[PDB]
Design a protein around this ligand. Structure first.
Ligand code: SF4
Ligand SMILES: [Mg+2]
Ligand SMILES: [Mg+2]
Ligand SMILES: [Mg+2]
Ligand SMILES: [Mg+2]
Ligand SMILES: [Mg+2]
Ligand SMILES: [Mg+2]
Ligand SMILES: [Mg+2]
Ligand SMILES: [Mg+2]
Ligand SMILES: [Mg+2]
Ligand SMILES: [Mg+2]
Ligand SMILES: [Mg+2]
Ligand SMILES: [Mg+2]
Ligand SMILES: [Mg+2]
Ligand SMILES: [Mg+2]
Ligand SMILES: [Mg+2]
Ligand SMILES: [Mg+2]
Ligand SMILES: [Mg+2]
Ligand SMILES: [Mg+2]
Ligand SMILES: [Mg+2]
Ligand SMILES: [Mg+2]
Ligand SMILES: [Mg+2]
Ligand SMILES: [Mg+2]
Ligand SMILES: [Mg+2]
Ligand SMILES: [Mg+2]
Ligand SMILES: [Mg+2]
Ligand SMILES: [Mg+2]
Ligand SMILES: [Mg+2]
Ligand SMILES: [Mg+2]
Ligand SMILES: [Mg+2]
Ligand SMILES: [Mg+2]
Ligand SMILES: [Mg+2]
Lengths: 208, 125, 84, 151, 84
RNA sequence: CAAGGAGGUAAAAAUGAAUC
RNA sequence: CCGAGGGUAGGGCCCGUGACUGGGGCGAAGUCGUAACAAGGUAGCUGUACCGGAAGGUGCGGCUGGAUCACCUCCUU
RNA sequence: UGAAACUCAAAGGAAUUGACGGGGGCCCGCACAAGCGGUGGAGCAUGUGGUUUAAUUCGAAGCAACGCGAAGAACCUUAC
RNA sequence: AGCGCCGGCCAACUCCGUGCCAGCAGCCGCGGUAAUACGGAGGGCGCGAGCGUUACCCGGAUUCACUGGGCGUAAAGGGC
C-alpha cells in the first residue's frame, strides 16, 4: 500500500517541515528543530549543488509526500489534470485537495492525513448520508462530509473535534463542530492554499 | 532534392538489423551446452571470462557468457539464452540466465540476486 | 611441464620470499596459468621483439614483468623482477 | 538583486615545451526574473576568477525581454552558425520545456512557460548565443506598429 | 647452471610453501649448497642405485628427501617431498 | 638603382624497447 | 471431352554442403624491409602498362591535395 | 551496375598551441676550425659492470651513474 | 514486504575484503594496495504487490529532412 515507516526522515530529507504527524509537528521535538539536516551517515556533510533534475525530483517527492500518495495515483491525477481545460497546475492542486482523506484532515476530524485515511477506511466517515470507506473519493462541490452514527462517541474523535473547535477552516470549506459535519463549498484556488511547492517544477518534471 | 525527385524516387526507410539472430524473435531460448571453458578478453582488459558454446533449439550453435562467480555447467547442461552482448568478448553476443534448468544460481550473493537467480536468504527473518 | 629457472630469475624470486609475499602469489598464479595456456591467459601475455626476441612477457605488477620462453617440453623463466 | 547562475565550467589546454598548461572558462547567466537577462563568457587560470570575470562580462552585455504575462510574444527561429534554436509561446501553466542552457537563460529572464527545441549543433556556447540573439529579436505589437506607422 | 623443476616436484615445493615455512628455508639452504658443490654440502649427499642411478638424495627432514640430478648446464630436482 | 618571368637542389645513413 | 492426382523427360530460381583454394577481419608489440607523414631523405598522389620477396620501382600523360625560402646556367639595369 | 556476412567506436574536415625537419632567414656557447696539453697502449691507485663467495650489504645507470653517497671499511663505521 | 540502483548520463557515500585475480558493463570505461565502478556490510535513493532483466515497435534520430538536411576541402556534381 502507501508508505509505512519513518516519517521524520522524509520531513528531514526535503529540508522543509510538512506536517505529517500532527501534535508532534507543533511540538518543539519536530526533529527539524533539533536536526535540520538530511538523514543518513552523510547528513552533516558538505551540501553539494544539486542539478536541475534533482530540484524537480525533490520538488515532486515533496508534493507527493505532503498528501501521502503513491506514484500510481499521483501520476494518474496529473495525467487527468494535464488533459483538461484550464491551467494544469491549479487543477492538479484542486484534484489533489478533493481526495476524501484530505478533506477529512482539513475538516479537523484527524490531526494527520494518515490518521484521516485510517478513519475513512474504517467507515468512520459518512458522505451525504451513506458511509464511504474509500480514501480516494473525489469530493464534488456541495457534498456533506460527516461522521457515522455508530461512530459518534469515539473518545479519539471527541478530542479532535474539541481541538478543532476554535480553528477556522479554509474558504472552500464549512464546518459544524457541534453537528459533526462539514461541506465542500468549491474547488480551492491557487491562492487559497499556500503549500511549500512550486507547481511549475512538478509539471516540467513529468514532461520528460 | 527537388519535389519531382521526391515523387519519382521517394524516401528510403531504415530497416534496422537485429543484433540477436539466434533468438529468432524469442525473448529466451533453451539450449544444450557443448563446450564450457574460459576465454581471454579484448583490447584494454585482462581476465578469464567463462563462456559456453550452446547448441540451442533453433538449430544454431553460438557462444554465450556465464555471469557471476562460479557455475555448475558441463558438456550436457541445458541452459537458457537471455541475450545481450559482452563488449570485451568477440563472437559472444548472448547471455546465460542463472537459476534455470541446469544453470543454478550463484551462492552467497545477497545484493543483486534477482539477477543471477539467488533465493531470498532468511536469517530466520 | 618442467620449469627452467635462470641464475637471475631464481635470485629475483628468492629476494621476494624474504621481501614481499603477494608478488610471489602473483608469479605462482602466472606460472600456473602459463603451463595451461602458454600464450593467452593472465598477465596479458604478448610476444617480445628485437631485444628479447623469442620471449613472452606477463605482467606481475605495472612495473614488474615475468619474461619467459616456451618449448614442447619445458618453460624457461628469464626474469621475474624489474622492467625487462 | 541579480541572480547569478553558472552553467558551463570547462577546462581547456595549451601546449608548451614540457607539458600541458591549463586555463579555465566559465559561462554564466545573470537575470532578475523581471525581463532583464545577460550572458557572459570569461577566461582565467582559476575557477572563481573565471566566474567573477564572466559575471562582470554578463552584467555588461544585457538585453530587454518583452514578456507577455507568462511568455514571449511570438515564435522565432535563430541560427547561430551551426546551432539553431526554436522558441515558441505557450499557455499559462505548462512549464519551462527547455534543455540545460535555454532553461537557465529564460528562467532568469522571467519566463514562466515556454516551448523550445535545440537543433543542429548542441554546443552550449552557441546555443546560449543563439538564445540571446533570439531574445534580442523579440518584438511586441506596439513595436511592430511603431515601425509600420511611417514616421 | 639453471633450475629445472618436475611437475610433481614443483607441486611439492609449492605444497611446502603454503604449508611449512621452516621446511622451505631448509630446502633453499640445500639447493644453494648444490650449485657451489653438487656432490658435496649438507644433506648427507648419497647417490641412489639400480633404477635411480644418476640421482643423488639429501634429507631435509628424517622423512622427506631432495632427489636431484646434476648436469654441466643444469640441475634436475625430481622431488622435495617423500610421497606416502 | 629594385626584383620578377623562368632552373638546375640534400645523402650512403635503416629501425625503435612491449606501464597507451 | 474435361478432370484430382500418379508417372516420364527436359528446363528456371533459391537453400544447405564439398577435397582444395582466394582474399577480409580479430588476436595492444612474431619475421623481413622503409613505401607514405618534415624537400620523409628520389615531392606526393593518380589512370594505365610492365616488372620486382614485400611495401613498391620505372615508362607515358595528368593533378596541387608540392615546390623560386641562396649560389649558379638561359632572357633583361 | 553493384551488395552482404563479419568487424571497428570511430573514420574524418578546417583551424589553435606546441614538438620536429637530412625546410628556410637572423644569432649565440672551446660547438667546429686555428693552437697547446691529454685519455685509449704500459705499471699502479680508486670506482663500476661481470663472475666468484657463507657474505662479498645497499644505492647511483647516457649527457646530468662510474676516486659518486665514504670529507677517510684493521675490530668501530657496518646495514652482509 | 519485497525489488532495482547509489562513478557520469542518473536521485543516492563510507568502511572492510580483493589486488589487470575474482569480477562489472548500455556507452565512456573500472580492477596490476587505501577501488564512492568487483564482493560484502552500514547508510541512502527510486518504486512498492511489486521491482528488475530479455525480445520487439515508436521516440529521442532535423542520423531518409512534406513539415524538417545536404554535395569546394567532412559522404555527395554525372568526364563533356
Ligand atoms: S514532527 Fe512533523 S514536521 Fe517534524 S519531522 Fe516529524 S513529520 Fe516532519
Ligand atoms: Mg468512512
Ligand atoms: Mg582493465
Ligand atoms: Mg547552417
Ligand atoms: Mg644503409
Ligand atoms: Mg625491423
Ligand atoms: Mg500432372
Ligand atoms: Mg620522400
Ligand atoms: Mg621514407
Ligand atoms: Mg630521383
Ligand atoms: Mg604510374
Ligand atoms: Mg625496374
Ligand atoms: Mg610524371
Ligand atoms: Mg589536368
Ligand atoms: Mg679542434
Ligand atoms: Mg691506460
Ligand atoms: Mg634501497
Ligand atoms: Mg534504477
Ligand atoms: Mg548524483
Ligand atoms: Mg552491480
Ligand atoms: Mg589491503
Ligand atoms: Mg580497498
Ligand atoms: Mg554502475
Ligand atoms: Mg559496492
Ligand atoms: Mg496495486
Ligand atoms: Mg523521424
Ligand atoms: Mg525539407
Ligand atoms: Mg547531413
Ligand atoms: Mg579526401
Ligand atoms: Mg569529399
Ligand atoms: Mg564537373
Ligand atoms: Mg561515366
Amino acid at each position: 500500500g502507501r508508505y509505512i515507516g519513518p516519517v521524520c526522515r522524509l520531513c528531514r530529507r526535503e529540508g522543509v517541515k510538512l506536517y505529517l504527524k500532527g501534535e508532534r509537528c507543533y511540538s518543539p521535538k519536530c526533529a527539524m528543530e533539533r536536526r535540520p539536516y538530511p538523514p543518513g551517515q552523510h547528513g552533516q556533510k558538505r551540501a553539494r549543488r544539486p542539478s536541475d533534475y534533482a530540484v524537480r525530483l525533490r520538488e515532486k517527492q515533496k508534493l507527493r509526500r505532503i498528501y501521502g500518495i503513491s506514484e500510481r495515483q499521483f501520476r494518474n491525477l496529473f495525467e487527468e489534470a494535464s488533459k483538461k481545460k484550464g491551467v494544469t497546475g491549479s487543477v492538479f492542486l484542486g484534484l489533489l485537495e478533493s481526495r476524501l482523506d484530505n478533506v477529512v484532515y482539513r475538516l479537523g476530524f484527524a490531526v494527520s492525513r494518515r490518521q484521516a485515511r485510517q478513519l475513512v477506511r474504517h467507515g468512520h466517515i459518512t458522505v451525504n448520508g451513506r458511509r464511504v470507506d474509500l480514501p480516494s473519493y473525489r469530493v464534488r462541490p456541495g457534498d456533506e462530509i460527516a461522521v457515522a452514527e455508530k461512530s459518534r462517541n469515539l473518545e479519539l474523535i471527541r478530542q479532535n473535534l474539541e481541538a478543532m473547535k476554535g480553528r477556522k477552516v479554509g474558504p472552500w470549506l464549512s464546518l459544524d463542530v457541534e453537528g459533526m459535519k462539514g461541506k465542500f463549498l468549491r474547488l480551492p484556488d491557487r491562492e487559497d492554499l499556500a503549500l511549500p511547492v512550486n507547481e511549475q517544477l512538478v509539471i516540467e518534471f513529468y514532461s520528460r | 532534392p527537388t519535389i519531382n525527385q521526391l515523387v519519382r524516387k521517394g524516401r528510403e526507410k531504415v530497416r534496422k538489423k537485429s543484433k540477436v539472430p539466434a533468438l529468432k524473435g524469442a525473448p529466451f531460448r533453451r539450449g544444450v551446452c557443448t563446450v564450457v571453458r574460459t576465454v581471454t578478453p579484448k583490447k584494454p582488459n585482462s581476465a578469464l571470462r567463462k563462456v559456453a558454446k550452446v547448441r540451442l533449439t533453433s538449430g544454431y550453435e553460438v557462444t554465450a557468457y556465464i555471469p557471476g562467480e562460479g557455475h555448475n555447467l558441463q558438456e550436457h547442461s541445458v541452459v537458457l539464452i537471455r541475450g545481450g552482448r559482452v563488449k570485451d568478448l568477440p563472437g559472444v553476443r548472448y547471455h546465460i540466465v542463472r537459476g534455470v534448468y541446469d544453470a543454478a544460481g550463484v551462492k552467497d550473493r545477497k545484493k543483486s540476486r534477482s539477477k543471477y537467480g539467488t533465493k531470498k536468504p532468511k536469517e530466520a527473518a | 611441464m618442467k620449469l627452467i629457472w635462470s641464475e637471475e630469475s631464481w635470485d629475483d624470486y628468492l629476494y621476494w620470499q624474504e621481501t614481499d609475499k603477494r608478488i610471489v602469489k602473483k608469479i605462482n598464479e602466472l606460472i600456473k596459468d602459463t603451463r595451461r595456456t602458454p600464450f593467452e591467459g593472465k598477465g596479458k601475455p604478448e610476444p617480445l621483439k628485437h631485444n628479447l626476441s623469442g620471449f613472452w612477457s606477463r605482467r606481475i605488477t605495472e612495473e614488474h614483468r615475468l619474461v619467459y620462453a616456451v618449448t614442447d617440453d619445458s618453460l624457461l623463466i628469464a626474469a621475474c623482477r624489474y622492467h625487462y | 538583486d541579480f541572480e547569478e547562475k553558472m552553467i558551463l565550467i570547462r577546462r581547456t589546454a595549451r601546449m608548451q615545451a614540457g607539458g600541458r598548461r591549463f586555463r579555465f572558462g566559465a559561462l554564466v547567466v545573470v537575470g532578475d526574473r523581471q525581463g532583464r537577462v545577460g550572458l557572459g563568457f570569461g577566461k582565467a587560470p582559476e575557477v572563481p576568477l573565471a566566474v567573477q570575470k564572466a559575471g562582470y562580462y554578463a552584467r555588461r552585455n544585457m538585453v530587454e525581454v518583452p514578456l507577455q504575462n507568462g511568455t514571449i510574444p511570438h515564435e522565432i527561429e535563430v541560427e547561430f552558425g551551426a546551432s539553431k534554436i526554436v522558441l515558441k509561446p505557450a499557455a499559462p501553466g505548462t512549464g519551462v520545456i527547455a534543455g540545460a542552457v535555454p532553461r537557465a537563460i529564460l528562467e532568469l529572464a522571467g519566463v514562466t512557460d515556454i516551448l523550445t527545441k535545440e537543433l543542429g549543433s548542441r554546443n552550449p556556447i552557441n546555443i546560449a548565443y543563439a538564445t540571446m540573439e533570439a531574445l534580442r529579436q523579440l518584438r511586441t505589437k506596439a513595436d511592430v506598429e511603431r515601425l509600420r506607422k511611417g514616421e
